[PDB]
Amino acid sequence: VTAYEEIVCQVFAAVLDRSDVTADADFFALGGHSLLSLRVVARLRALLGVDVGVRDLFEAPTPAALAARLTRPAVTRRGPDAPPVLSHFQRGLWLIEQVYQTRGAYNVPLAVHVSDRLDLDVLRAAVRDLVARHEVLRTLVRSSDDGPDPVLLAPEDAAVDVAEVQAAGPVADLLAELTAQPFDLATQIPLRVRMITGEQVDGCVLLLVCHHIAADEWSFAPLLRDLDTAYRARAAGRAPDWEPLPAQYSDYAATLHDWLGEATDPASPLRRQLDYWQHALQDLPDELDLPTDRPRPATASHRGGLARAELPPELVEAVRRLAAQHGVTVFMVVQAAVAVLLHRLGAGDDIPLGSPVADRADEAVHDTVGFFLNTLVLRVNLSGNPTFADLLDRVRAVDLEAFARADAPFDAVVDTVKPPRAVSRHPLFQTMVSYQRRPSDVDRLFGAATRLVEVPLDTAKFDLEFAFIEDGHGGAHIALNYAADLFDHDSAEQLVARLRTVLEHACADPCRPVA
Numbered sequence: 128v129t130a131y132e133e134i135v136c137q138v139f140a141a142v143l144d145r146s147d148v149t150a151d152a153d154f155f156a157l158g159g160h161s162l163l164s165l166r167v168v169a170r171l172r173a174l175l176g177v178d179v180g181v182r183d184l185f186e187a188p189t190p191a192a193l194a195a196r197l198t199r200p201a202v203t204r205r206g207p208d209a210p211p212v213l214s215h216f217q218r219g220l221w222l223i224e225q226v227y228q229t230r231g232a233y234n235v236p237l238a239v240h241v242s243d244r245l246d247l248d249v250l251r252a253a254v255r256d257l258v259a260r261h262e263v264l265r266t267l268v269r270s271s272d273d274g275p276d277p278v279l280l281a282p283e284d285a286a287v288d289v290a291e292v293q294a295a296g297p298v299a300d301l302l303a304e305l306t307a308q309p310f311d312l313a314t315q316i317p318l319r320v321r322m323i324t325g326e327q328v329d330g331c332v333l334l335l336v337c338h339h340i341a342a343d344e345w346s347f348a349p350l351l352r353d354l355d356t357a358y359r360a361r362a363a364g365r366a367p368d369w370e371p372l373p374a375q376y377s378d379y380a381a382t383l384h385d386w387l388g389e390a391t392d393p394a395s396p397l398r399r400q401l402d403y404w405q406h407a408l409q410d411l412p413d414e415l416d417l418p419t420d421r422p423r424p425a426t427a428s429h430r431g432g433l434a435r436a437e438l439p440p441e442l443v444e445a446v447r448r449l450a451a452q453h454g455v456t457v458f459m460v461v462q463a464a465v466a467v468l469l470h471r472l473g474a475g476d477d478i479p480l481g482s483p484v485a486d487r488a489d490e491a492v493h494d495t496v497g498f499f500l501n502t503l504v505l506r507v508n509l510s511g512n513p514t515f516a517d518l519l520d521r522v523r524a525v526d527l528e529a530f531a532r533a534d535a536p537f538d539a540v541v542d543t544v545k546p547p548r549a550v551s552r553h554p555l556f557q558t559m560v561s562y563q564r565r566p567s568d569v570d571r572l573f574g575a576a577t578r579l580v581e582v583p584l585d586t587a588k589f590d591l592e593f594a595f596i597e598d599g600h601g602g603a604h605i606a607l608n609y610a611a612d613l614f615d616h617d618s619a620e621q622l623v624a625r626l627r628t629v630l631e632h633a634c635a636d637p638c639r640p641v642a
């Protein structure tokens with residue numbers, strides 16, 4: 128869970144009085160010692176509500192290690208002859224695509240503007256190195272009677288898909304179209320690479336499209352890192368000089384499967400976490416009374432738009448202060464604000480919000496390529512006329528309770544809860560809230576000037592998806608990915624603007640009742 132990691136970071140920063148606390152920063156190297164160790168332990172106990180001690184800090188002196196310490200066997204490499212293993216999370220992504228026919232909605236884009244036009248032959252060679260390094264990028268998925276079956280292509284058998292595209296109209300719409308193009312994972316590797324050039328394009332835009340089964344947003348940094356390494360090596364006519372991965376995704380999947388156990392085992396983590404979610408999601412609403420422009424259609428088209436709400440740096444910093452002062456993450460502030468927004472729009476006091484949680488505590492997978500996101504239903508209650516500060520306490524309690532049962536795959540949770548189904552409605556929740564941080568130090572890739580560019584998606588996965596997105600070099604914005612079937616664009620622009628308004632009011636005076 129990344130949430131533990133940012134809480135430990137916020138605690139390190141406050142105690143050491145430093146603004147440079149990263150997930151890999153050693154507490155004692157940061158300037159800490161035994162005296163300040165007591166203050167870190169005391170603050171983490173009051174915030175996290177778990178019995179943490181000096182021992183945990185000593186053995187795990189970095190936020191990533193300490194967070195992982197609070198979250199199960201370590202991932203072990205299974206040897207070269209081991210067959211591929213699809214994780215439960217991958218199986219869930221395969222199910223939603225087959226059962227709900229989401230076409231291209233789950234494709235993950237990663238677009239980088241490059242001041243130089245890249246060499247297509249070197250890029251293709253580098254993509255082959257990237258695919259050879261990360262087995263998940265050359266793992267096909269084929270249907271069967273039992274379900275999906277992984278098929279690991281050998282590096283020499285994985286035909287990479289690398290092509291240059293000349294941009295006619297605006298580049299942003301081309302990026303969205305290329306992203307929406309569906310994969311056939313039975314015959315194509317889950318990676319498409321496109322270099323967009325044109326008279327309007329200065330240099331090129333490098334677009335990586337991954338099928339979600341093979342990458343999450345947390346994979347952007349290792350993707351660009353490794354692709355840059357391979358491109359530079361291939362431009363010099365050599366193979367990239369890198370060590371093997373400490374673990375492949377199949378290693379992570381096998382370890383997760385063995386630890387989860389069988390749902391029929393009363394002592395297995397799977398059944399115990401499923402039992403929690405069965406109780407926690409009792410009497411859940413089928414859906415929230417949101418203000419749509421059109422009724423929910425019989426079948427979902429999964430068309431969508433993207434409405435941005437720019438946040439002034441002073442608002443981003445005020446939101447950070449509000450999170451730090453109440454001992455919550457920025458995500459919890461955003462999640463609380465979204466709950467207030469839907470509440471003020473008439474959704475009631477019982478607000479289920481879907482949210483991704485990253486299962487990247489193990490150091491063998493903490494910085495690797497793959498899909499490590501589970502989906503949790505964060506059920507926030509707004510009854511009793513709470514203030515926003517009160518809500519931040521409720522949200523923290525709901526989230527921490529949820530983060531302790533984050534391994535039960537969301538599809539098993541849907542099976543256990545058994546809500547009424549509808550192919551045009553995502554079950555258990557239809558609004559997702561997430562916090563995302565884009566990679567830093569990706570400005571000099573491929574020996575050029577580079578910058579990430581956001582892709583304006585033409586697809587949507589739920590009714591509403593709110594994302595607080597930090598760019599990695601200072602700024603932040605809210606991205607609302609809305610279902611076009613339900614909302615017009617201007618309704619979504621208004622929705623994302625009213626969320627910023629709620630955030631502005633919460634920072635100004637968190638003691639206002641949310642009603």
Ligand SMILES: *P(=O)(O)OCC(C)(C)[C@@H](O)C(=O)NCCC(=O)NCCOC(=O)[C@@H](N)CC(C)C
Nearest residue numbers: 155158159160161162163164165181182184185
């Ligand atoms: P954190 O890891 O930074 O902890 C700080 C210290 C330095 C470990 C702190 O615990 C500490 O001061 N340890 C020192 C303990 C120590 O050295 N005691 C000396 C023993 O003195 C006596 O007890 C005395 N009876 C010695 C006899 C042999 C005469």
